[PDB]
Amino acid sequence: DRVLRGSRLGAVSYETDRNHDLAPRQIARYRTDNGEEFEVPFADDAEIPGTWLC
Amino acid sequence: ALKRLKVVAAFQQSGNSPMGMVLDAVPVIPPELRPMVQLDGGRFATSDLNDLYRRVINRNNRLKRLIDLGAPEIIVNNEKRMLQESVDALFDNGRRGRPVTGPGNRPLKSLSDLLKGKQGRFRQNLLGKRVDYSGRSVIVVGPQLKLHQCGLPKLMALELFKPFVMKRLVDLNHAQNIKSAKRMVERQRPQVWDVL
Amino acid sequence: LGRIQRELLQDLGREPTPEELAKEMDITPEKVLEIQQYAREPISLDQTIGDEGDSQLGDFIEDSEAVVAVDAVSF
Amino acid sequence: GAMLDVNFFDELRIGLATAEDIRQWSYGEVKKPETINYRTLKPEKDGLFCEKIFGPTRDWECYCGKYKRVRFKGIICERCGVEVTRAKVRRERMGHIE
Amino acid sequence: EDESEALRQARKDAELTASADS
Amino acid sequence: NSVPGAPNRVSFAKLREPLEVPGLLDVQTDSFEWLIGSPRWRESAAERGDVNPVGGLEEVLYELSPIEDFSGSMSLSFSDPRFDDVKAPVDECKDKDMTYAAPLFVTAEFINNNTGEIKSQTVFMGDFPMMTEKGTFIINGTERVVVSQLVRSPGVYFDETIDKSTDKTLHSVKVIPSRGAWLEFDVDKRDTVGVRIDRKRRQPVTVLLKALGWTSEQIVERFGFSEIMRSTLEKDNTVGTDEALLDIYRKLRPGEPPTKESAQTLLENLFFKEKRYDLARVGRYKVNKKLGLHVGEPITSSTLTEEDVVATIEYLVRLHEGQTTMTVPGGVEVPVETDDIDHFGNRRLRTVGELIQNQIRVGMSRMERVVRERMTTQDVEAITPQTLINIRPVVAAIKEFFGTSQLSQFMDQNNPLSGLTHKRRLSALGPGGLSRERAGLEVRDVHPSHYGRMCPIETPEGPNIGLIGSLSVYARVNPFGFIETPYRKVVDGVVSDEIVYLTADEEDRHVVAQANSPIDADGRFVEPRVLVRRKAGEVEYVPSSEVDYMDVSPRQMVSVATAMIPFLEHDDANRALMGANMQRQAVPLVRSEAPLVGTGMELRAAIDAGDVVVAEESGVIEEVSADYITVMHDNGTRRTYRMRKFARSNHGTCANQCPIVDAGDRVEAGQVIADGPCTDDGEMALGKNLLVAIMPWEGHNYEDAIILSNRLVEEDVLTSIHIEEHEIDARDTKLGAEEITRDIPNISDEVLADLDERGIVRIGAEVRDGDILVGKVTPKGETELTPEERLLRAIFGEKAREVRDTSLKVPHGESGKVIGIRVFSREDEDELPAGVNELVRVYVAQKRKISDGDKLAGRHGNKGVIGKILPVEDMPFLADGTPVDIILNTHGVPRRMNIGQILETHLGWCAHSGWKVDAAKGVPDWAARLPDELLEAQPNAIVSTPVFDGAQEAELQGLLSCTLPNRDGDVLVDADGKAMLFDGRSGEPFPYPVTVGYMYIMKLHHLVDDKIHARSTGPYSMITQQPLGGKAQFGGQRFGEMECWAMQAYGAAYTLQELLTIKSDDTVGRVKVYEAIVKGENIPEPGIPESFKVLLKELQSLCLNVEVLSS
Ligand SMILES: [Zn+2]
């Protein structure tokens, strides 16, 4: 009677979750006003802005 | 005193605070559980919590704007009252006063109606669920069979045992790859019965 | 579009051509179609397409962007 | 230990929420009543479908489009704001309203 | 004069609560 | 007789009915003619009540007009509805996918009476759906039928209820008028008479009386006997006329002080102002007949009256006093008693005319509201009715009734019989009626007023028993919607022939005789103490002078389908119900042989079903063909009758027709000229005559399965034709536009061996499962590329293939030729949904043989699947070598009590082999009641025993005694009906003789290939992740909680956990299972199902700190 189709706005890939040869990562640290660290793992080749939303 | 002493002694034995009744930060359900799907044809479907969340967002932002502005208490407390009513309408729509409705005047299905009643995740997905590797047909009498045997039509059993027969007829090199095996099974070439 | 098109259908006695509303706006009928697309409110999922209240709308939508589970193992 | 969800259960205990537990659960603070753009059909910023909070919408796809490789993983992108990971985290990433 | 009490008693408590939303 | 080309079918009926069967579709055609205002309806209502000949459309317009301002200074007047002829013929409208229609015209006049200024136009009102010759509508190309409805009529309804404590007969009046308020006059345990109007309090009756102008002296003057009412008149403690009126107003209206003008106007509004209360003509007639207010005055002034109110009060109080009859002042006496709502004088029949009239009324009110509000906004004396009138809500109301309403059912046509009996159906649910949960058990029963007005046998057997029922044969619908029934009017023991239609109330008044009473050949009775039905559903014995109504015939209580079962009076009602229910699920075969023994009502049910071409004027056939017949009339004119060769029915069966005449014959007006789907020489035929035997055979027919010979498959005895329609279309996507090409993604030229130059396959190309029918490929846009795919594409050197294929392919197990390919295009100026460019439809027509798994059934509800089709040689045979064709089982007859099949089988053998009663020494003793020319008959000649006056068992034994031999001197079937069967497998004869004979069995449309489906891994749901359900797609089976209980009670934990984790929910584990199966490794351990994670996230969302505990 009523059978439809549809998809969410997004596509799906199919890879392998290797966990060794990842991109080189710099870990950056930010801080709020009330002493709250928020560790931000960036790339190693990445500019670090002085401010960041947490 | 006894009827109060139930919950009083419960809080006494508990290490839990009695601060749980008030709330400062409503949590947000992840967006896959409230899908923003669209159909082939530009028609968009949501699951009715987005309207309630949007309403609470509007009231909260307006109250924050008024409290940084500095306003008389009639305005501020009316805004607080409608914010409180909005949060109540989010958590259980239809308990107190009137349920918030929308187009067609159906009340909006709140969070609690995803558990309450016969359409929640305690009955409606816990009665039963459809399974794969299934099938059904009509039955006839098989009076030459032994007791542990039963018949099966081939056009059903071929569909039932499809991955097993894919593996076996790759292992006998009738089709060198899985896609070739699938097309051979779909075209129903005569080797599949002796494999089956 | 809504007010003027309502005026034009009332004077016509029927809802006019997209070319007619377009030349009323002196734009293209496909632009009128785009306005028709953007103006339509999103449907909900909680209304029951069954005759009684038995099933939500989302129980009849297949997945158009899922994995067929043969190409994945093939990959 | 209901974080990585091991397949060994002993008890299931229900308690009572606190504001600190809620803000510890959350991955941001939604502050705009915006869901999608009317034309490009892409999610908005700091809304109900904010990708910066509720993860990306495609598998290891950052929002601007620079980092698109599985070699990138768990790397937040300063230009678009999102962290590169699978689109399955939209099932279980929590936000909170302030 | 036989049935008024319960209907009036329910009706007054029904009309008291519902008229005080905002 | 009385149909000229009828086959000669001798009958066993002793009686001779006076009245032939009516036209079986006058429950529909007459109702729609009443709505339209046909000339034929006009003259018929002229000869049956010409005081008010008025169509329904004229009545609704007369009710609406005039429409005016609030100042009364201008007037808008409606008059004179009018129809022209149609816009398109029937078959062309069916093929080109629109609605059968006709234009509608009225004479709408606007006057501005500020000085008197009329303006009259002829306003086009819209396209109006109309009913064909058969009695169905055609909506959007498909075919639809409106099913009649049973509601209870407006009017008064007294009763009494007892108290458990006081044991008082609580006499309660209820008036439930159409679109009005409610009021009641009730007596409680106290001696108090309420007037508790519309869910309010029991005020004294004198309060309403003094409101209407009846003070206490007038009350006691009119009522010198109502001691209970004068007890209230002492108990009332409130006196005064306007004091009573203001008391009524202040009790009625909270929030307002009692003001006299509002007190007057609200009472007038609820009682005499017709806008917010108007009981209809039916309710007005009901009240005027119940209380006897008027004498011969027709229906006018359809509001209340104080005379009616005080007569109601008098009737109630005298009923509670214990009066049995009473004359109202100025009126005749009436019996005084209670009422039951299931009595069939109080459940009228809202047919198609009434339903459409209500729809047009509810549309026209919404139209005229806009008109009345828009005339204010328009200027004065500068407007016209063309500017005034907006017919959009009327046409929207019509289309939203024809769609989206369960009373506009889809037309159900497996065969002419089911097509006929889908009309003449009386439902009970729907809008304005009660649902199935509200269906209390005293509405599904058989009230004994049903005798002749609704068949008690036929009903759907599911959870709808008794709600949906069919009409009787001879019934007829009143102008008010009541159900009449013919009766002979016997006078003084002499049976006349003035056939008098009666309703349920007059049937309760008088004394009704029985159908087969022994009349003495001139009118006189024979026995003095005859059978009689009485008022209370009693069966008595009366001297033959109180009899005034004899039945027209037997079988008056029975439906159309249940008048075709032979020997119905020997069967139980359960199996008769199942037989008449599965007589509407046959399939049209390709040979369609008429049954050897049936009832005489098979010819009429075929020529009245409309699916047989019937010549209209007497003449001589000039030229026949396979597709058109040119009958030459007497005077010059000719006429050609086109056929419909292999058109698809609504359920997927063919609808072929074929002529049955020659090029030189003379036909008369009314003769059958062309057989339809399930017809042979005019009469109905649903199955074949198959030789049967009733022994159990080696376990292949256990618990009523059925075995069959192979001669049925070889000779195509049971071979239906099915036609399936597949549809695909080309919309516009975001990434471009889809197209229909030969060229596709990388599939070889082998699959392009049949596709034409522009997509779809050629006509006649035999297809198999899964082949391409339409080649369509969609613009998928461009996505990113994996490096591995990049390397493989660099290796092989191929097209990027930037488009994705979506080709229409034939689903599983379907095959056969291709009949027709209908193609619609948006470019080709056709009606399409927006965005769709080309719409195509392919018809695939497999010819389906009989096979095991199919369902066969006799006429008496002895169904059963087909067990094992044996080869022809090892199937038992008589002494002549003729093998039998189907072997039933004998354990299924005595425990179900349907020995009609055994009597039918014996008569089938007698009618096949032919008889001749040896009248050497005159007529034998059993053949006294037998007619002439049933004494002897040729072999393979047909008979007909009617339903409730059939052949007796003595006549059956007497016929079985003399059954003239086949070719040699050989009576294969001896006096008992049995025969001596050899065995084809072993070779020795069976030691005991076995019943044989010629049964008649059909083929049922619940074939196996519709039903069998499997699913390995297919599509999935979106919001949840369970697999899909349904046989159109793959679909997986529901695993209910009872099966969960079964697995738990067995103790298999792992199978239950597997069925609830990795086959339905665990989306990341399903593919791991699939690849482990394909590679050949062990099945991995299951993970956490997704439903549990959904529940966990919901509980975290509801501010519940849910945590798991390890230790
Ligand atoms: Zn980015």
Side-chain angles (χ1 to χ4, degrees), chain F residues 13-29:
Chain F
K14 277 90 187 185
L15 294 179
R16 178 194 54 90
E17 34 82 23
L19 174 63
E20 72 168 16
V21 193
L24 302 192
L25 292 173
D26 306 22
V27 83
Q28 298 264 14
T29 41

mmCIF file with all atom_site columns, all heavy atoms in Angstrom, chain F residues 13-29:
data_model
loop_
_atom_site.group_PDB
_atom_site.id
_atom_site.type_symbol
_atom_site.label_atom_id
_atom_site.label_alt_id
_atom_site.label_comp_id
_atom_site.label_asym_id
_atom_site.label_entity_id
_atom_site.label_seq_id
_atom_site.pdbx_PDB_ins_code
_atom_site.Cartn_x
_atom_site.Cartn_y
_atom_site.Cartn_z
_atom_site.occupancy
_atom_site.B_iso_or_equiv
_atom_site.pdbx_formal_charge
_atom_site.auth_seq_id
_atom_site.auth_comp_id
_atom_site.auth_asym_id
_atom_site.auth_atom_id
_atom_site.pdbx_PDB_model_num
ATOM 1   N N   . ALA F 1 13 ? -38.763 -28.552 -8.292  1.00 0.00 ? 13 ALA F N   1
ATOM 2   C CA  . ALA F 1 13 ? -39.586 -27.779 -7.374  1.00 0.00 ? 13 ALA F CA  1
ATOM 3   C C   . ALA F 1 13 ? -41.051 -28.161 -7.494  1.00 0.00 ? 13 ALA F C   1
ATOM 4   O O   . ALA F 1 13 ? -41.621 -28.144 -8.587  1.00 0.00 ? 13 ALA F O   1
ATOM 5   C CB  . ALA F 1 13 ? -39.413 -26.289 -7.643  1.00 0.00 ? 13 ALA F CB  1
ATOM 6   N N   . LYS F 1 14 ? -41.661 -28.502 -6.363  1.00 0.00 ? 14 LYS F N   1
ATOM 7   C CA  . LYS F 1 14 ? -43.074 -28.853 -6.355  1.00 0.00 ? 14 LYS F CA  1
ATOM 8   C C   . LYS F 1 14 ? -43.957 -27.622 -6.452  1.00 0.00 ? 14 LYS F C   1
ATOM 9   O O   . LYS F 1 14 ? -45.023 -27.669 -7.070  1.00 0.00 ? 14 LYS F O   1
ATOM 10  C CB  . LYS F 1 14 ? -43.422 -29.635 -5.091  1.00 0.00 ? 14 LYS F CB  1
ATOM 11  C CG  . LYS F 1 14 ? -43.111 -31.107 -5.159  1.00 0.00 ? 14 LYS F CG  1
ATOM 12  C CD  . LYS F 1 14 ? -41.717 -31.398 -4.677  1.00 0.00 ? 14 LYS F CD  1
ATOM 13  C CE  . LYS F 1 14 ? -41.368 -32.838 -4.921  1.00 0.00 ? 14 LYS F CE  1
ATOM 14  N NZ  . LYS F 1 14 ? -40.044 -33.179 -4.353  1.00 0.00 ? 14 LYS F NZ  1
ATOM 15  N N   . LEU F 1 15 ? -43.534 -26.518 -5.855  1.00 0.00 ? 15 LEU F N   1
ATOM 16  C CA  . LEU F 1 15 ? -44.378 -25.342 -5.778  1.00 0.00 ? 15 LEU F CA  1
ATOM 17  C C   . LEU F 1 15 ? -44.391 -24.582 -7.097  1.00 0.00 ? 15 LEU F C   1
ATOM 18  O O   . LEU F 1 15 ? -43.825 -25.005 -8.105  1.00 0.00 ? 15 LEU F O   1
ATOM 19  C CB  . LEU F 1 15 ? -43.905 -24.420 -4.663  1.00 0.00 ? 15 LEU F CB  1
ATOM 20  C CG  . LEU F 1 15 ? -44.046 -24.996 -3.265  1.00 0.00 ? 15 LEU F CG  1
ATOM 21  C CD1 . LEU F 1 15 ? -43.532 -24.001 -2.265  1.00 0.00 ? 15 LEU F CD1 1
ATOM 22  C CD2 . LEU F 1 15 ? -45.492 -25.335 -2.986  1.00 0.00 ? 15 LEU F CD2 1
ATOM 23  N N   . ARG F 1 16 ? -45.066 -23.442 -7.077  1.00 0.00 ? 16 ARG F N   1
ATOM 24  C CA  . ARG F 1 16 ? -45.089 -22.515 -8.201  1.00 0.00 ? 16 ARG F CA  1
ATOM 25  C C   . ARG F 1 16 ? -45.225 -21.123 -7.602  1.00 0.00 ? 16 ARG F C   1
ATOM 26  O O   . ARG F 1 16 ? -46.322 -20.721 -7.208  1.00 0.00 ? 16 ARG F O   1
ATOM 27  C CB  . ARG F 1 16 ? -46.225 -22.830 -9.160  1.00 0.00 ? 16 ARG F CB  1
ATOM 28  C CG  . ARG F 1 16 ? -46.322 -21.871 -10.328 1.00 0.00 ? 16 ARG F CG  1
ATOM 29  C CD  . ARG F 1 16 ? -47.646 -22.028 -11.052 1.00 0.00 ? 16 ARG F CD  1
ATOM 30  N NE  . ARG F 1 16 ? -48.778 -21.906 -10.138 1.00 0.00 ? 16 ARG F NE  1
ATOM 31  C CZ  . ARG F 1 16 ? -49.387 -20.761 -9.849  1.00 0.00 ? 16 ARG F CZ  1
ATOM 32  N NH1 . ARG F 1 16 ? -48.976 -19.631 -10.404 1.00 0.00 ? 16 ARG F NH1 1
ATOM 33  N NH2 . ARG F 1 16 ? -50.407 -20.745 -9.004  1.00 0.00 ? 16 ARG F NH2 1
ATOM 34  N N   . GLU F 1 17 ? -44.114 -20.406 -7.512  1.00 0.00 ? 17 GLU F N   1
ATOM 35  C CA  . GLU F 1 17 ? -44.136 -19.080 -6.930  1.00 0.00 ? 17 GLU F CA  1
ATOM 36  C C   . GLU F 1 17 ? -44.844 -18.103 -7.864  1.00 0.00 ? 17 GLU F C   1
ATOM 37  O O   . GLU F 1 17 ? -44.790 -18.253 -9.084  1.00 0.00 ? 17 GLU F O   1
ATOM 38  C CB  . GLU F 1 17 ? -42.718 -18.604 -6.641  1.00 0.00 ? 17 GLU F CB  1
ATOM 39  C CG  . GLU F 1 17 ? -41.692 -19.079 -7.646  1.00 0.00 ? 17 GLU F CG  1
ATOM 40  C CD  . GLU F 1 17 ? -41.660 -18.227 -8.891  1.00 0.00 ? 17 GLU F CD  1
ATOM 41  O OE1 . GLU F 1 17 ? -42.091 -17.061 -8.814  1.00 0.00 ? 17 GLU F OE1 1
ATOM 42  O OE2 . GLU F 1 17 ? -41.211 -18.717 -9.946  1.00 0.00 ? 17 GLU F OE2 1
ATOM 43  N N   . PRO F 1 18 ? -45.531 -17.125 -7.321  1.00 0.00 ? 18 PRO F N   1
ATOM 44  C CA  . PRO F 1 18 ? -46.240 -16.173 -8.177  1.00 0.00 ? 18 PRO F CA  1
ATOM 45  C C   . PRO F 1 18 ? -45.372 -15.014 -8.623  1.00 0.00 ? 18 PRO F C   1
ATOM 46  O O   . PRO F 1 18 ? -45.600 -14.437 -9.690  1.00 0.00 ? 18 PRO F O   1
ATOM 47  C CB  . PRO F 1 18 ? -47.383 -15.684 -7.282  1.00 0.00 ? 18 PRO F CB  1
ATOM 48  C CG  . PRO F 1 18 ? -47.352 -16.563 -6.070  1.00 0.00 ? 18 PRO F CG  1
ATOM 49  C CD  . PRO F 1 18 ? -45.950 -16.999 -5.924  1.00 0.00 ? 18 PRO F CD  1
ATOM 50  N N   . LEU F 1 19 ? -44.376 -14.661 -7.824  1.00 0.00 ? 19 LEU F N   1
ATOM 51  C CA  . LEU F 1 19 ? -43.620 -13.437 -8.028  1.00 0.00 ? 19 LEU F CA  1
ATOM 52  C C   . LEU F 1 19 ? -42.205 -13.774 -8.456  1.00 0.00 ? 19 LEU F C   1
ATOM 53  O O   . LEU F 1 19 ? -41.489 -14.474 -7.735  1.00 0.00 ? 19 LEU F O   1
ATOM 54  C CB  . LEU F 1 19 ? -43.595 -12.600 -6.756  1.00 0.00 ? 19 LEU F CB  1
ATOM 55  C CG  . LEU F 1 19 ? -42.706 -11.369 -6.850  1.00 0.00 ? 19 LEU F CG  1
ATOM 56  C CD1 . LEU F 1 19 ? -43.223 -10.431 -7.922  1.00 0.00 ? 19 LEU F CD1 1
ATOM 57  C CD2 . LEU F 1 19 ? -42.629 -10.670 -5.516  1.00 0.00 ? 19 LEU F CD2 1
ATOM 58  N N   . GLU F 1 20 ? -41.793 -13.251 -9.604  1.00 0.00 ? 20 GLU F N   1
ATOM 59  C CA  . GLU F 1 20 ? -40.426 -13.449 -10.047 1.00 0.00 ? 20 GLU F CA  1
ATOM 60  C C   . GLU F 1 20 ? -39.475 -12.566 -9.245  1.00 0.00 ? 20 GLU F C   1
ATOM 61  O O   . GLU F 1 20 ? -39.885 -11.633 -8.555  1.00 0.00 ? 20 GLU F O   1
ATOM 62  C CB  . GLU F 1 20 ? -40.289 -13.143 -11.532 1.00 0.00 ? 20 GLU F CB  1
ATOM 63  C CG  . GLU F 1 20 ? -40.375 -11.669 -11.856 1.00 0.00 ? 20 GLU F CG  1
ATOM 64  C CD  . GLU F 1 20 ? -39.940 -11.362 -13.274 1.00 0.00 ? 20 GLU F CD  1
ATOM 65  O OE1 . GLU F 1 20 ? -39.861 -12.305 -14.092 1.00 0.00 ? 20 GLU F OE1 1
ATOM 66  O OE2 . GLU F 1 20 ? -39.668 -10.180 -13.571 1.00 0.00 ? 20 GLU F OE2 1
ATOM 67  N N   . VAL F 1 21 ? -38.194 -12.884 -9.345  1.00 0.00 ? 21 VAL F N   1
ATOM 68  C CA  . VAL F 1 21 ? -37.150 -12.175 -8.597  1.00 0.00 ? 21 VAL F CA  1
ATOM 69  C C   . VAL F 1 21 ? -37.039 -10.749 -9.120  1.00 0.00 ? 21 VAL F C   1
ATOM 70  O O   . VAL F 1 21 ? -37.182 -10.533 -10.334 1.00 0.00 ? 21 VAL F O   1
ATOM 71  C CB  . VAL F 1 21 ? -35.827 -12.921 -8.739  1.00 0.00 ? 21 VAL F CB  1
ATOM 72  C CG1 . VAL F 1 21 ? -34.809 -12.436 -7.748  1.00 0.00 ? 21 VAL F CG1 1
ATOM 73  C CG2 . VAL F 1 21 ? -36.061 -14.399 -8.559  1.00 0.00 ? 21 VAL F CG2 1
ATOM 74  N N   . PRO F 1 22 ? -36.831 -9.750  -8.267  1.00 0.00 ? 22 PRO F N   1
ATOM 75  C CA  . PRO F 1 22 ? -36.656 -8.380  -8.754  1.00 0.00 ? 22 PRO F CA  1
ATOM 76  C C   . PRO F 1 22 ? -35.333 -8.198  -9.478  1.00 0.00 ? 22 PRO F C   1
ATOM 77  O O   . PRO F 1 22 ? -34.488 -9.089  -9.544  1.00 0.00 ? 22 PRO F O   1
ATOM 78  C CB  . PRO F 1 22 ? -36.688 -7.544  -7.477  1.00 0.00 ? 22 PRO F CB  1
ATOM 79  C CG  . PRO F 1 22 ? -37.434 -8.353  -6.529  1.00 0.00 ? 22 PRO F CG  1
ATOM 80  C CD  . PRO F 1 22 ? -37.088 -9.768  -6.822  1.00 0.00 ? 22 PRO F CD  1
ATOM 81  N N   . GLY F 1 23 ? -35.167 -7.006  -10.044 1.00 0.00 ? 23 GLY F N   1
ATOM 82  C CA  . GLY F 1 23 ? -33.868 -6.594  -10.528 1.00 0.00 ? 23 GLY F CA  1
ATOM 83  C C   . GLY F 1 23 ? -32.936 -6.431  -9.352  1.00 0.00 ? 23 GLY F C   1
ATOM 84  O O   . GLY F 1 23 ? -33.207 -5.626  -8.447  1.00 0.00 ? 23 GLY F O   1
ATOM 85  N N   . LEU F 1 24 ? -31.835 -7.170  -9.342  1.00 0.00 ? 24 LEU F N   1
ATOM 86  C CA  . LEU F 1 24 ? -31.034 -7.301  -8.135  1.00 0.00 ? 24 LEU F CA  1
ATOM 87  C C   . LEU F 1 24 ? -30.208 -6.068  -7.811  1.00 0.00 ? 24 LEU F C   1
ATOM 88  O O   . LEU F 1 24 ? -29.531 -6.060  -6.783  1.00 0.00 ? 24 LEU F O   1
ATOM 89  C CB  . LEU F 1 24 ? -30.109 -8.509  -8.248  1.00 0.00 ? 24 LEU F CB  1
ATOM 90  C CG  . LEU F 1 24 ? -30.751 -9.867  -8.489  1.00 0.00 ? 24 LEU F CG  1
ATOM 91  C CD1 . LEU F 1 24 ? -29.739 -10.935 -8.283  1.00 0.00 ? 24 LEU F CD1 1
ATOM 92  C CD2 . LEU F 1 24 ? -31.876 -10.083 -7.545  1.00 0.00 ? 24 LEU F CD2 1
ATOM 93  N N   . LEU F 1 25 ? -30.227 -5.034  -8.649  1.00 0.00 ? 25 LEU F N   1
ATOM 94  C CA  . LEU F 1 25 ? -29.429 -3.842  -8.403  1.00 0.00 ? 25 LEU F CA  1
ATOM 95  C C   . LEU F 1 25 ? -30.287 -2.597  -8.233  1.00 0.00 ? 25 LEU F C   1
ATOM 96  O O   . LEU F 1 25 ? -29.803 -1.470  -8.414  1.00 0.00 ? 25 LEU F O   1
ATOM 97  C CB  . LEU F 1 25 ? -28.416 -3.655  -9.524  1.00 0.00 ? 25 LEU F CB  1
ATOM 98  C CG  . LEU F 1 25 ? -27.370 -4.753  -9.465  1.00 0.00 ? 25 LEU F CG  1
ATOM 99  C CD1 . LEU F 1 25 ? -26.474 -4.681  -10.655 1.00 0.00 ? 25 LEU F CD1 1
ATOM 100 C CD2 . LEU F 1 25 ? -26.574 -4.622  -8.196  1.00 0.00 ? 25 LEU F CD2 1
ATOM 101 N N   . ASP F 1 26 ? -31.542 -2.771  -7.856  1.00 0.00 ? 26 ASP F N   1
ATOM 102 C CA  . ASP F 1 26 ? -32.394 -1.636  -7.567  1.00 0.00 ? 26 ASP F CA  1
ATOM 103 C C   . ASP F 1 26 ? -32.221 -1.132  -6.148  1.00 0.00 ? 26 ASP F C   1
ATOM 104 O O   . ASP F 1 26 ? -32.887 -0.173  -5.758  1.00 0.00 ? 26 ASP F O   1
ATOM 105 C CB  . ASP F 1 26 ? -33.843 -2.001  -7.837  1.00 0.00 ? 26 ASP F CB  1
ATOM 106 C CG  . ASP F 1 26 ? -34.032 -2.539  -9.229  1.00 0.00 ? 26 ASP F CG  1
ATOM 107 O OD1 . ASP F 1 26 ? -33.031 -3.011  -9.804  1.00 0.00 ? 26 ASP F OD1 1
ATOM 108 O OD2 . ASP F 1 26 ? -35.160 -2.474  -9.756  1.00 0.00 ? 26 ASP F OD2 1
ATOM 109 N N   . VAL F 1 27 ? -31.335 -1.752  -5.370  1.00 0.00 ? 27 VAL F N   1
ATOM 110 C CA  . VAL F 1 27 ? -30.885 -1.143  -4.128  1.00 0.00 ? 27 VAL F CA  1
ATOM 111 C C   . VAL F 1 27 ? -29.871 -0.039  -4.381  1.00 0.00 ? 27 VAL F C   1
ATOM 112 O O   . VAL F 1 27 ? -29.584 0.746   -3.474  1.00 0.00 ? 27 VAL F O   1
ATOM 113 C CB  . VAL F 1 27 ? -30.330 -2.247  -3.211  1.00 0.00 ? 27 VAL F CB  1
ATOM 114 C CG1 . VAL F 1 27 ? -28.909 -2.556  -3.558  1.00 0.00 ? 27 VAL F CG1 1
ATOM 115 C CG2 . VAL F 1 27 ? -30.443 -1.860  -1.764  1.00 0.00 ? 27 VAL F CG2 1
ATOM 116 N N   . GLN F 1 28 ? -29.341 0.066   -5.598  1.00 0.00 ? 28 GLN F N   1
ATOM 117 C CA  . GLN F 1 28 ? -28.359 1.083   -5.949  1.00 0.00 ? 28 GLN F CA  1
ATOM 118 C C   . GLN F 1 28 ? -28.854 2.031   -7.026  1.00 0.00 ? 28 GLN F C   1
ATOM 119 O O   . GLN F 1 28 ? -28.725 3.259   -6.878  1.00 0.00 ? 28 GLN F O   1
ATOM 120 C CB  . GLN F 1 28 ? -27.070 0.411   -6.419  1.00 0.00 ? 28 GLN F CB  1
ATOM 121 C CG  . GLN F 1 28 ? -26.401 -0.432  -5.378  1.00 0.00 ? 28 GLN F CG  1
ATOM 122 C CD  . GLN F 1 28 ? -25.321 0.319   -4.652  1.00 0.00 ? 28 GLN F CD  1
ATOM 123 O OE1 . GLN F 1 28 ? -25.240 1.536   -4.740  1.00 0.00 ? 28 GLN F OE1 1
ATOM 124 N NE2 . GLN F 1 28 ? -24.478 -0.402  -3.933  1.00 0.00 ? 28 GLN F NE2 1
ATOM 125 N N   . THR F 1 29 ? -29.409 1.487   -8.112  1.00 0.00 ? 29 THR F N   1
ATOM 126 C CA  . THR F 1 29 ? -29.831 2.327   -9.226  1.00 0.00 ? 29 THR F CA  1
ATOM 127 C C   . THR F 1 29 ? -30.998 3.225   -8.846  1.00 0.00 ? 29 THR F C   1
ATOM 128 O O   . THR F 1 29 ? -31.037 4.394   -9.241  1.00 0.00 ? 29 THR F O   1
ATOM 129 C CB  . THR F 1 29 ? -30.205 1.462   -10.419 1.00 0.00 ? 29 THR F CB  1
ATOM 130 O OG1 . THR F 1 29 ? -30.930 0.318   -9.962  1.00 0.00 ? 29 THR F OG1 1
ATOM 131 C CG2 . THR F 1 29 ? -28.966 1.012   -11.142 1.00 0.00 ? 29 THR F CG2 1
#
